[PDB]
């Protein structure tokens, strides 16, 4: 399904950004800039994927109990992006 493909892209992207974030502080500045810039792009990609998934969840899933389950997951993912990507990235770019 499209949804599954979106979710797979999301999780893959989330893992990569977290790995880049953990690795960034130990890279030389020249390399660290490139790394943070890519993480910032991935942050934007992750938010866009939530929008996309929400649209797809709405169109493709008729089960009202199941649609609720997906919604909670999206909401938790949004919070994970904020806390595990956006906030640590901002902090690194700030110092």
């Amino acid at each position: 399904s499209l949804l599954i493909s979106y979710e797979s892209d999301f999780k893959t992207t989330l893992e990569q950004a977290k790995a880049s974030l953990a690795e960034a502080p130990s890279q030389p500045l020249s390399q660290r800039n490139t790394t943070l810039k890519h993480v910032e792009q991935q942050q934007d990609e992750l938010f866009d994927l939530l929008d996309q998934m929400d649209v797809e969840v709405n169109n493709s899933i008729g089960d009202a109990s199941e649609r609720a389950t997906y919604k909670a997951k999206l909401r938790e993912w949004k919070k994970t992006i904020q806390s595990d990507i956006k906030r640590p990235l901002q902090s690194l770019v700030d110092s």
Partner: protein
């Protein structure tokens, strides 16, 4: 009487905004955009850019024009933090709205600065537009 001791990044911005008529290269601009992802380099990039707005005038207009080009590029390719820093200083950009210069042949050159400034201010006031422009920048 010390040397001004320009850093490498500061030298990059001086270069990207010198008085030559051909414009900063793609790769130079890209390199500057990378600098916006750490505190020191980004502070240096902001100061050098905004120094040109205040230190240059008249027949040195192309330096201002180039500083505006750099700034626009950085909105599209630099850090979100850099964009917020630039907003906080919109005032320093807005003063250039009435930049005027007529060259040694009658041609209006100040109009290049002015329209550039006008488009830059429009961009900065519109989060949705910035968002879309950064998307475009990545694809291309």
């Amino acid at each position: 009487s010390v040397d001004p001791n320009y850093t490498e990044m500061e030298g990059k911005v001086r270069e990207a905004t010198n008085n030559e008529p051909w414009g900063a290269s793609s790769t130079l601009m890209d390199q500057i955009s990378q600098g916006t992802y750490n505190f020191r380099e980004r502070e240096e990039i902001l100061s050098m850019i905004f120094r040109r707005f205040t230190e240059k005038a008249g027949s040195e207009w192309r330096q201002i024009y180039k500083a505006l080009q750099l700034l626009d590029y950085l909105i599209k390719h630099g850090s979100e933090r850099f964009i917020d820093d630039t907003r906080n200083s919109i005032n320093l950009i807005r003063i250039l709205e009435t930049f005027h210069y007529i060259d040694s042949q009658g041609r209006d050159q100040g109009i290049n600065v002015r329209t550039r400034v006008k488009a830059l201010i429009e961009l900065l006031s519109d989060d949705n537009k910035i968002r879309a422009e950064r998307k475009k920048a990545r694809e291309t």
